[PDB]
Amino acid sequence: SVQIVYKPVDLSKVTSKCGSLGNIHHKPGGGQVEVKSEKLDFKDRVQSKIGSLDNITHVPGGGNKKIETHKLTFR
Amino acid sequence: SVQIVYKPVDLSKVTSKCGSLGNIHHKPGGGQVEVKSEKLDFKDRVQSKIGSLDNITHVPGGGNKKIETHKLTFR
Amino acid sequence: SVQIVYKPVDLSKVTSKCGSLGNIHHKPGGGQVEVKSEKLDFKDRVQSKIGSLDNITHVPGGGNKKIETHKLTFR
Amino acid sequence: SVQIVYKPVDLSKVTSKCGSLGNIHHKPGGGQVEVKSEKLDFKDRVQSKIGSLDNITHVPGGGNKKIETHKLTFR
Amino acid sequence: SVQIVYKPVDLSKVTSKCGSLGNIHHKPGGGQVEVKSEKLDFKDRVQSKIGSLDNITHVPGGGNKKIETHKLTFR
Amino acid sequence: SVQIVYKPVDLSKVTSKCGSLGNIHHKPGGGQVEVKSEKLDFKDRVQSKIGSLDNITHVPGGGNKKIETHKLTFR
Amino acid sequence: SVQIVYKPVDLSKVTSKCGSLGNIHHKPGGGQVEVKSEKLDFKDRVQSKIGSLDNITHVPGGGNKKIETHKLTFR
Amino acid sequence: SVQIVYKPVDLSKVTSKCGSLGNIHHKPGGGQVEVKSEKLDFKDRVQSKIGSLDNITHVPGGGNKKIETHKLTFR
Amino acid sequence: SVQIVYKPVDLSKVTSKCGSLGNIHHKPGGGQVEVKSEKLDFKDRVQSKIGSLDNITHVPGGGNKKIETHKLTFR
Amino acid sequence: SVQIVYKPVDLSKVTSKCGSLGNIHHKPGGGQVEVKSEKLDFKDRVQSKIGSLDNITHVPGGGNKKIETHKLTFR
């Protein structure tokens, strides 16, 4: 009675070509940071951060991506 | 009675070509930061951040992307 | 009785070509930041940020994108 | 009784070509920022930000995009 | 009565080519950080961080990715 | 008695081919100069120069030279 | 009696081919100079230079030279 | 009596081929100079230079030279 | 009586091929200089140089030389 | 009586092939110099140099030389 046929075909290509990648320079919090405090009161949770935190330099030669979902559902 | 046939065909291409990529320079919080406080009162949660935080330099040679959903659903 | 046939064909191309990409310069919060406070009162949650935060330099050689949905649904 | 046939064909191309891309310069919050406060009262949630935040330099060599939906629905 | 056939075919390729990748420089918290405190009171959990923390330099030669889900579900 | 004959032939070519030439940035400049002088004596001619002088940026697309001397001399 | 014959032939070629040339950055510059002088004496001509002088950035696409001398001399 | 014959032939080629040339950064510069002088005496000509002088950045795409002398001499 | 014949032949080639040339960084520079002088005496010509002088960055894509002398001499 | 014949033949080739050339970093530089002098005497010409002088970065893609002398001499 029923025939289902699921024949997707994919010959795709995600591509990149880069002769030369360079001279990157990241210089966060190069300056001066000063914190003075007097007579502070805290009745609840404190988080502090002070300085140069969480600084990223992310230099992929590629960095190319592909996402592909397939789904076939039946009642 | 029923025939379903699902034959998508994809020969696509997401492509890039870059001779030379360079001389990038990121210089956040180069200046001076000063914080003075007197007689502060807190009855609830504090989060602080002070300085140069979360600074990103993201330099993919590629950075090319493709997303493809397929779905086939039946009652 | 029923025949469904789903044969999309795609030979597309998203493409770019860039001889030379450079001399980028990002210089946030280069100046001076001063915060003085006296006799502050807080009865509820505080978030602060002070300085140079969350600054991005995003330089993809490619940066090309393609999105493609396919859906075939039946009652 | 019924025949449905879904044969879209796509030979499209989204394309760009750029000899040289450069000399970009982003200089936010170069000046001076001063905040003085006396006798402030807060009965509810505070968010502050002070300085140079969230500044983006986004320089894709490509930056070309294509979106394509296909849908075929039946009762 | 029922025949289901699930024959997706994939000949895809996510690719990159990079002649030379270099001269990367990450210099967070190069400046000076000073914290003075007098007469602080805490009635709840404290987290502090002070200095240069969590700074990443991530330089993959490749960095190319592919994700592919397949699902076939029946009642 | 004497026969002198000078028949040089030249079919040369100096050639160049450059797709794209970009992104030069020269800064012979920015800095400070101070000169203080007390009780100086000069008994012969003086030349001075003070500041940013004679600084060049020379970006020829071609920039190809060809120099050819011919000489024929008789006594 | 005498026969002199000078028949040079040249079919040479000096050639160059460069897809893309980019991203130069010269900074002969930035810094500070100070000169103080007291009770100096000069009995003959003086030349001075003080600052940023005679600094070049030379970026020819071609930049190919060819030099050819010919000489024929008789006594 | 005398027969002299000079028939040089040259079909040479000086050639270069460079896909992509990038990302130069010269900094002959930044630093500090100080000169103090007291009770100096000069009885003959003086030349001085002080600062950033005669500094070159030379980036030819080709940069190919060919030099050829010919000489024919008779007494 | 005398017959002299000079028939050099040259079909040479000086060649180079370089896919991608990148990422140079020269810093002849940064540092401090101080010169103090008291009670010096000069009875003949003086030359001085003080700072960053005559510093080169030479990045030819080709950079191929070929030098050829010819000489024919008779007495 | 005399017959002299000079028929050199050259079909040579000086060749180079380099896929990718990268990532040079020269720092002839950074450091401190101090010179103090008291009661010096010079009765003949003086030359001085003080700082960062005559420093080279030479990165030819090719950089191939070929030198050829020819000489034919008669008395």
Numbering used by the authors:
A (entry chain C), B (entry chain A), C (entry chain E), D (entry chain G), E (entry chain I), F (entry chain H), ...: 305 to 379
Give the exact sentences the study uses for this entry:
Dominantly inherited mutation D395G in the gene encoding valosin-containing protein causes vacuolar tauopathy, a type of behavioural-variant frontotemporal dementia, with marked vacuolation and abundant filamentous tau inclusions made of all six brain isoforms. We used cryo-EM to determine the structures of tau filaments extracted from the frontal and temporal cortices of the individual with vacuolar tauopathy. The ordered cores of the filaments span residues K274-R379 of three-repeat tau and S305-R379 of four-repeat tau. The CTE tau fold differs from the Alzheimer fold by having a more open conformation of the β-helix region, which contains an internal density of unknown identity.
Three types of filaments were observed that were made of two identical protofilaments arranged in different ways. Filament structures were determined to resolutions ranging from 2.3 to 3.4 Å, which allowed us to establish their identity as CTE filament Types I-III. All three filament types were found in the frontal cortex, with Type III being absent from the temporal cortex. The three types of filaments are molecular polymorphs consisting of two identical protofilaments that are linked in different ways. By cryo-EM, the tau fold was identical to that in CTE, SSPE and ALS/PDC. This is the first inherited tauopathy with the CTE fold.
